[PDB]
Amino acid sequence: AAKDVKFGNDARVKMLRGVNVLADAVKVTLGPKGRNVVLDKSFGAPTITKDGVSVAREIELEDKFENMGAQMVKEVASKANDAAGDGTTTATVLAQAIITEGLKAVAAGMNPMDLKRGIDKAVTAAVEELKALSVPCSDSKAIAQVGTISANSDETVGKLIAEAMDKVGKEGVITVEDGTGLQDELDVVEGMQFDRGYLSPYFINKPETGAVELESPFILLADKKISNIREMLPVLEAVAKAGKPLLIIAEDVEGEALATLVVNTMRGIVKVAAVKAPGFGDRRKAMLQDIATLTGGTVISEEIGMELEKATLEDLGQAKRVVINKDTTTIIDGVGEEAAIQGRVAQIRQQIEEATSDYDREKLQERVAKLAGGVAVIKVGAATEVEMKEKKARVEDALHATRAAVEEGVVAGGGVALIRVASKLADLRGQNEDQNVGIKVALRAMEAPLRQIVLNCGEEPSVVANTVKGGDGNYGYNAATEEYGNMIDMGILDPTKVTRSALQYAASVAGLMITTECMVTDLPK
Amino acid sequence: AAKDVKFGNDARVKMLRGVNVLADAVKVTLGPKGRNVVLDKSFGAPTITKDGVSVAREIELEDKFENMGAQMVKEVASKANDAAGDGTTTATVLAQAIITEGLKAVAAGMNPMDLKRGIDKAVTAAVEELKALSVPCSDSKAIAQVGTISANSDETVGKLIAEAMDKVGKEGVITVEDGTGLQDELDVVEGMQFDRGYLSPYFINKPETGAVELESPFILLADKKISNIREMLPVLEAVAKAGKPLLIIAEDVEGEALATLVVNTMRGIVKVAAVKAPGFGDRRKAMLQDIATLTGGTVISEEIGMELEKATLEDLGQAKRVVINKDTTTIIDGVGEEAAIQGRVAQIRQQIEEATSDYDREKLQERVAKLAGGVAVIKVGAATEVEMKEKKARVEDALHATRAAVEEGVVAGGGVALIRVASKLADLRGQNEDQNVGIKVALRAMEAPLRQIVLNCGEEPSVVANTVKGGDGNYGYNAATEEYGNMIDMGILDPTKVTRSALQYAASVAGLMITTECMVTDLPK
Amino acid sequence: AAKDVKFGNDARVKMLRGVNVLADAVKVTLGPKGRNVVLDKSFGAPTITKDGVSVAREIELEDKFENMGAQMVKEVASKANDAAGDGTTTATVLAQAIITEGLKAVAAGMNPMDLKRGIDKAVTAAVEELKALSVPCSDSKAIAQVGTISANSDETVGKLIAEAMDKVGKEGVITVEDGTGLQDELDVVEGMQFDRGYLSPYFINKPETGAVELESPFILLADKKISNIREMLPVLEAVAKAGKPLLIIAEDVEGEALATLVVNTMRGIVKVAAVKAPGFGDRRKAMLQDIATLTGGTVISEEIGMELEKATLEDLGQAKRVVINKDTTTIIDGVGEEAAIQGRVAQIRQQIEEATSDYDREKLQERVAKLAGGVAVIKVGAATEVEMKEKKARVEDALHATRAAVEEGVVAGGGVALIRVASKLADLRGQNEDQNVGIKVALRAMEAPLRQIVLNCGEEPSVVANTVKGGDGNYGYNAATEEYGNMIDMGILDPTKVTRSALQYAASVAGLMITTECMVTDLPK
């Protein structure tokens, strides 16, 4: 259709206004004295939340240009939460800060490209300074402390996570499930996890987590692409009876076929969910088999001349529970016989011997680790269905936090790590004055989080920022107690990874917007 | 319906405004310091791109006359990218330049026809001057260098392309595919390629490339036109089962029949794609047979009295992969027996002997070259599905660039070749003063690309243009390093063919618009 | 009345717009390729002029805030012309440049006060650099060259001015008058000149020069302030008859009395003009007497008990011609007896002996220099009343130019001195970044004059500016011949004083505007 095209300054102010609505809406929730945001609902009572992510999801503006602005930072900011399980709100306020000043410099006639180079240079320096400030979290004692802090001071959760990582390693698969009732349970079972999300939402039956959860599902492994859903009918009908959900793991499930699955499972007849097979090329055919052996299923490939129409329930794999993400699938408690699974592991370990390469070797180790490592299952305690669901949430979060802390350590939270890191780059310079401004723009932005946190407390940002900068190390401002001291000792910290991702992702979208000269959108007509 | 008819000056200003929106939106991306353009989407997050072609595709104006202006240059500009795999954006800014000044001359009362003659004379002169400036790219050493520069300094790609051309000649068929995983692979298989694109989009299952890609497809060769899709049913049902895609190569597939194919393959039942048989007349019946032998299929012609209803899967040809373009079809790895294929080649080679003509001789050689030459298949390396897809893209582009460089050489990029070439035509004259103005209009326009590139860098076009014109040879301005020197040595160049096509195509649509006196479009009602 | 009060940014944009109308209207006349500006008249034919000063005088804007903007630079810019007889237009374009960028920096959030300090620092540096660049003009050979260049290459004028300065010194009083017909005449007569302008316009009878010119006037010297014009009547009636103009030199002439004088001389009855007595305190009573002796008049002071009512024509002084300026009064050819005048000089020279101070000594020398020095009278040649009036104008201008050149030398005109001077201050720095921006703002502005001159020629400013900056010394661009070379040798120069004043006055009003936060004006109601 006819488009409305905006340029330079007009385009920029629109974007600015868009992110201002987004950021302004979200940042009110930042910090321990964060405010409530009321999100309306089509039917029922409004939602009252302090969850910056929930607010961000609801933001859509009427002005198409302003909306594009909001949707852009809204998008990369979410990339942060995906990478470290936290930081979107931070990334959002950081973005507003860089963009606001960056755009001012542009309007003042400064070179957009040089401004961007400066911001980027400052960010790289800052990330290094961040690694230096970072404190390790390698032993279970630390792992537990961090988990406890994440679970809102619940030593139980901290303990659980530490025990779980002790069982499968701090890089091992760990899942959480509702408990059988009062008292937690930690079990390691035959399972696996690969990087492939649902082939479309709709399959999502747990919107709170935006996840697909199947119970006692069959598993169809097909080494091919599915176009004509007719091929499936005979098998789907079989799965229809037996009343069990079905997970389709194919090379791919195309539009129409996928549409059929969504519609039909949505009508109660047959519950299905599909995801692409892990990896590509040859390591794909191999992994598809691993899952088969792990779940006791039979891979159905055209090469050998097998057909889907002739596939029976006996060809299907099986597991007690599968969980599908926006980009992850995890199979829990596969039926596969330990004899076959363990034997399969043996075959792969010889491959590693006969391995005439390091790459081919690393890939084989990855597979055994999956097949042999299993899956740690944390079953959250209870005493009333409500508390049980609430604790399960804290555990899930504490888990993501701990996982990140184990990868890159921790740093002073409350936004002081960022302001501390910037205070050290006071002499960072670029190749020209525009680049210098860019650097100052970024460093100045790194104070946004703290300042916002302080503003929410009803205090004076300039003063607290001034004082935190005055000290060094992990000396900061505890927004909760409204007292200064060592942020780590006071137990106020963020995984170095979350702060890093928030900053890099913010700096990314900000740099893109600052170097945008034209916007195209449909005419409001 | 009732039309709105505009004339002379009114019609012209409308067109000018239309191309100004187009060009202005697209040219911001030009050069190494090109800016981002944000393209909105109906669902999801906006697209942020620096790809002039992507932006152009989205441009459609509300004012019908202004829109016709945009669609016109938008159309011939794309012809450039088709001819040399690059240059649309350049063509677009060149068109804005010629049109803007050309229209000024017209409003000043100058003769449109003489202005056009002058522009054309200047362009012809410029293209010759361009050939002179051109440096050859005939040996694999050069082929590799160019490919490397196109792949963004990836010697790997350069090497691959050079090896591929060494295998099938620099005028041979070369295709790229996803690899089996880490490490590239170059294979020559039985294949062929003819000049016939898809019989309609929709078949397109790879919009990124606007191509049709079928895997392990059957191939129906029918020496006739298909009207009643009923004739097909028996065969389509057969292809329906077996679950394999089908490529229809007929004399033509008419409206309704074609419609049916699109609808049904879009519903998952049977994947089809059709294209016209190569060539016309008698050399058509021959080529249709070559494909048959190459793919082990049987041509179905009415002449011999064969019927489509009685055609079985066994009559169908077969290949591992076929790729259809906007105007090209390439068959990869045909099943045809080497005994039959090679024997077929023998028959055609005797034809060349018994050839009582040069034309008839050239046509026969073309056929054997296709049948005997095969197809070089480059399988892009890997290590993660993402990097693999990204490298595959660079290879595909590098390939188009190298192919063009092999045909006509290279010249100083960054827009300096054009400005250099124009600096030499300072004395070019026409038959009258109007024609002289036309010549100056074109020469002046040839500076648009460089000037724009410089403007995007935040520098002064007048000065850089002035300096580049002051020197000679391939002395220019490296927009990346923002330093002067030899453009070729600094490795900043464009295939002479891309610069030539960009200019000729721009000059074409510009000449047409300058000589337009009336515009007709539907009433906005 | 009720006021309309504007603040910060709103106030600033208004001012900017106001000076933009002013500067934009005036700068089109700058340089040898200056354009014409058409100024309308209430009755008659429009005025077509290339005189930046004439255009400036006519500029008054409808929007009160925008108007205040224009009136401010319009005001200090004229101060330049007053100080060096030239430079208002330059000062105006310089002001637009500094203000435009200065305001941008402010909107970008930079400190107005620091920006102002930087501009000022750069200007001080630039004025010193200007003195260095300056070439002396001390001997009559130079004096003549400069005058010739100012008179538009008329060696005659140059010769005249040189002869005149040789007669009374280069710091002596020189006046120009219409000639007796063909062939110039240079004569030195008894006369004097002091720093006191007309007590109000209206007296002005030569608007072209904004001057008051009386022929064979009487001169009333009254050492008192005149309130009741009644005191005058007896004397005015006496001057009424005799039909001679009258110059009133009193301590002051108050409103009503002054009003009466304007009205009555405007009705044809008695021509009068009044100005304040020179100096103040005691040196005032002395100087008043000098004028008396020089003009053969009697000072009328109340101290001695004299009354104005009892003053007769015999008490009045007399001279052949007096010329009154906006702030200068010069008496030409006083009737005073040489015996009395020369004797008076003797008395003052003994004062210098008995002088017990350097100050008191300097003041006494000043007086004798006036009394003893006399006044050089240049009577412009002729051959037709028209040419005579036109030459008289060139002489008057050439005179002002030469006078200034004799005081501070000359520098490369065509705007190159300013751009040259700035090219040397590339490393000038302040105390903080804001101050540095200020310095760059000023240096950048110093290019405005040249750039504008080049733009009027239809050339590319960026290029010519780039080239002039590339060289050194007085190497510049001759806008007339449109060729580079030594500006002084090519005879294109400006008195160092004019360039200095233009820059300092521009920088002054610009600094004031940049540091303005509130504007108050009457409501348009």
A519: helix, strand or coil: strand
Q: B424: buried, middle or exposed (CB in 10 Å: 19+, 13-18, 0-12)?
A: middle
Bridge partners for B412 per DSSP: B493
Say which amino acid occupies C204.
Answer: I
- Collect all residues from A whose CB is shorter than 8 A from any CB in C: 101, 104-105, 107-109
Tell me the DSSP string of B81-139. HHHHS--HHHHHHHHHHHHHHHHHHHHTT--HHHHHHHHHHHHHHHHHHHHHH-B---S
Spatial distance between the Cα atoms of A274 and A253, rounded to a whole number of angstroms: 7
Tokens of C193: 């000149």
Distances (CA, A) of C29 to A394, A430, B133, C78: 76, 42, 45, 16
The angle that helices C461-470 and C416-423 make with each other, rounded to 10 degrees, is 60
The bridge status of strand A47-49 relative to strand A37-39 is antiparallel
Bridge partners for A318 per DSSP: A218
Q: Where does B200-269 have alpha helices with state H?
A: 233-240, 255-266
Whether B145 and B160 share a structural domain:
yes
Q: The sheet that has C185-189: what strands, in order across it?
A: C173-178, C375-380, C185-189
Say whether A2 and B62 touch across the interface (CB within 8 A): yes
Tokens of C221: 């010297």
Is the CB of residue B503 less than 8 Å from the CB of residue B446? Answer: yes
Q: Which residue is listed with tokens 């900000």? A: A510
Spatial distance between the Cα atoms of A91 and A510, rounded to a whole number of angstroms: 10
Residue A230 maps to which CATH number?
3.50.7.10
Q: Which residue is listed with tokens 């780590």? A: A488
Q: Which residue is listed with tokens 């090896």? A: B163
Tokens of C519: 């504007």
Find the discontinuities in chain A where C to next N exceeds 2.5 angstroms and give the residue preceding each: none
C329: helix, strand or coil: strand
Nearest to B119 by CA among B507, B525, B459, B411: B507
Q: For C106-144, give one letter per residue: b (16+ CB within 10 A) or e.
A: bebebbbebbbbbbbbbbebbbebbeebbeebeebebbb
Q: Flag whether A49 is marked binding.
A: no
Is the CB of residue C392 less than 8 Å from the CB of residue C484? Answer: no
Whether C338 and C380 share a structural domain:
no
3-state secondary structure C51-103: CHHHHHHHCCCCCHHHHHHHHHHHHHHHHHHHHHCCCHHHHHHHHHHHHHHHH
3-state DSSP helix/strand/coil % of chain A, to nearest 5:
50, 20, 30
Whether A415 and A405 share a structural domain:
no
Spatial distance between the Cα atoms of B383 and A366, rounded to a whole number of angstroms: 14
Question: H or E element: which one contains C255?
Answer: helix C255-266
Which residues does A346 contact at the CB level (< 8 Å), separation at least 6?
none
Q: Flag whether A50 is marked binding.
A: yes
Q: C-alpha angle with apex B96: B94 to B97, nearest 5 degrees?
A: 65
**B462: Cα within 13 Å, side-chain hemisphere:** 10
Is the CB of residue A74 less than 8 Å from the CB of residue A89? Answer: no
Q: Name the domain boundary from A409, A438, A463.
A: A409
Is the CB of residue C106 less than 8 Å from the CB of residue C115? Answer: yes
Distances (CA, A) of A447 to A312, B412, C39: 61, 47, 57
Q: Flag whether B494 is marked binding.
A: yes
Bridge partners for A485 per DSSP: A476
The bridge status of strand B375-380 relative to strand B185-189 is antiparallel
Q: Name the domain boundary from A343, A371, A399.
A: A371
Spatial distance between the Cα atoms of C421 and C410, rounded to a whole number of angstroms: 14
The bridge status of strand C173-178 relative to strand C375-380 is parallel
Is the CB of residue B361 less than 8 Å from the CB of residue B355? Answer: yes
Q: Which residue is listed with tokens 């074409």? A: B508
Whether C79 and C39 share a structural domain:
yes
- Full domain range(s) for residue A209: 191-371
Q: Name the domain boundary from A409, A435, A457.
A: A409
Which residues does B197 contact at the CB level (< 8 Å), separation at least 6?
B275, B324, B325, B326, B327, B328, B329
Tokens of C62: 């409808």
Spatial distance between the Cα atoms of C146 and C155, rounded to a whole number of angstroms: 10
Tokens of C260: 């009466």
B283: helix, strand or coil: helix
Tokens of B20: 């100004």
Q: Where does C108-244 have alpha helices with state H?
A: 112-133, 140-150, 155-168, 233-240
Contacts with C108 from chain A: Cβ below 8 Å: 104-105, 107-108
Distances (CA, A) of C400 to C30, C161, C171: 19, 10, 12
Say which amino acid occupies C6.
Answer: K
The sign of the torsion formed by the CA atoms of A281, A287, A293, A295 equals negative
Phi, psi of B169 (to 5 degrees): 90, 155
Question: H or E element: which one contains C397?
Answer: helix C385-408
Question: H or E element: which one contains A251?
Answer: strand A246-253
**B109: Cα within 13 Å, side-chain hemisphere:** 0
Tokens of C448: 């405005």
What is the distance between the terminal CA atoms of chain A, rounded to a whole angstrom? Answer: 10
Whether A328 and A417 share a structural domain:
no
Q: How many residues does chain A have?
A: 525
Count the Cβ atoms, other than its own, within 10 Å of residue A353: 8
Is the CB of residue B468 less than 8 Å from the CB of residue B477? Answer: yes
Whether B56 and B158 share a structural domain:
no
Identify the closest residue of chain B to C464 by CA–CA distance.
B463
- Collect all residues from B whose CB is shorter than 8 A from any CB in A: 21, 24-25, 28, 33, 35-40, 42, 45-46, 48, 55, 58-62, 67, 178-182, 240, 243, 266-271, 382-383, 385, 388, 457-458
What's the domain count of chain B?
A: 3
Contacts with A254 from chain B: Cβ below 8 Å: 268
Whether C519 and C481 share a structural domain:
yes
Return the residue in B27, B29, B37, B38 with the most chain A beta carbons within 10 A, the one to mutate for interface testing: B38
The sign of the torsion formed by the CA atoms of A215, A219, A225, A227 equals negative
Is the CB of residue A284 less than 8 Å from the CB of residue A278? Answer: yes
Spatial distance between the Cα atoms of B267 and B255, rounded to a whole number of angstroms: 19
Phi, psi of A483 (to 5 degrees): -140, 150
Spatial distance between the Cα atoms of C421 and C416, rounded to a whole number of angstroms: 8
Which residues does C346 contact at the CB level (< 8 Å), separation at least 6?
none
Distances (CA, A) of C507 to C109, C123, C493: 21, 7, 22
Distances (CA, A) of B385 to B179, B210, C11: 10, 21, 59
CB pairs < 8 Å spanning A and C: 14
Tell me the DSSP string of A97-162. HHHHHHHHHHHTT--HHHHHHHHHHHHHHHHHHHHHH-B---SHHHHHHHHHHHTTS-HHHHHHHH
Residue B400 maps to which CATH number?
3.30.260.10
- B touches which chains (3+ CB pairs under 8 A)? A, C
Count the Cβ atoms, other than its own, within 10 Å of residue B486: 15
The sign of the torsion formed by the CA atoms of B460, B465, B466, B471 equals positive
Whether C305 and C205 share a structural domain:
yes
CB pairs < 8 Å spanning A and B: 109
Spatial distance between the Cα atoms of A197 and A330, rounded to a whole number of angstroms: 10
Is the CB of residue C410 less than 8 Å from the CB of residue C145? Answer: no
Identify the closest residue of chain B to C465 by CA–CA distance.
B463
Q: Flag whether B427 is marked binding.
A: no
CA dihedral defined by B174, B180, B186, B189, rounded to 10 degrees? -70
Q: Which residue is listed with tokens 């002058």? A: B118
3-state DSSP helix/strand/coil % of chain B, to nearest 5:
50, 20, 30
Among left, alpha and beta (phi > 0; psi -120 to 50; other), residue A472 is beta
Phi, psi of C268 (to 5 degrees): 95, -20
Tokens of B461: 């076009």
Q: In Å, how far is C109's CA from the nearest CA of chain A?
A: 8
Whether C350 and C251 share a structural domain:
yes
Q: What is the DSSP letter of A209?
A: T
Say whether B59 and A113 touch across the interface (CB within 8 A): no
Q: Which residue is listed with tokens 């008058």? A: C177
Spatial distance between the Cα atoms of A469 and A424, rounded to a whole number of angstroms: 9
Residue set of the binding site of C for ATP: 29-32, 50, 86-90, 414, 478-480, 494
Return the residue in A9, A12, A433 with the most chain C beta carbons within 10 A, the one to mutate for interface testing: A433
Residue B47 maps to which CATH number?
1.10.560.10
Spatial distance between the Cα atoms of A292 and A122, rounded to a whole number of angstroms: 49
Tell me the DSSP string of A46-89. PEEE--HHHHHHH---SSHHHHHHHHHHHHHHHHHHHHHS--HH
Contacts with B243 from chain A: Cβ below 8 Å: 227-228, 231, 302
Whether B218 and B346 share a structural domain:
yes
3-state DSSP helix/strand/coil % of chain C, to nearest 5:
50, 20, 30
Count the Cβ atoms, other than its own, within 10 Å of residue B283: 15
Question: H or E element: which one contains B400?
Answer: helix B385-408
Is the CB of residue B203 less than 8 Å from the CB of residue B404? Answer: no
Is the CB of residue A38 less than 8 Å from the CB of residue A92? Answer: no
Bridge partners for A173 per DSSP: none
Whether B461 and B395 share a structural domain:
no
Please indicate the experimental technique that yielded this structure. Answer: X-ray
Whether A216 and A98 share a structural domain:
no
Spatial distance between the Cα atoms of A393 and B24, rounded to a whole number of angstroms: 51
Is the CB of residue A359 less than 8 Å from the CB of residue B383? Answer: yes
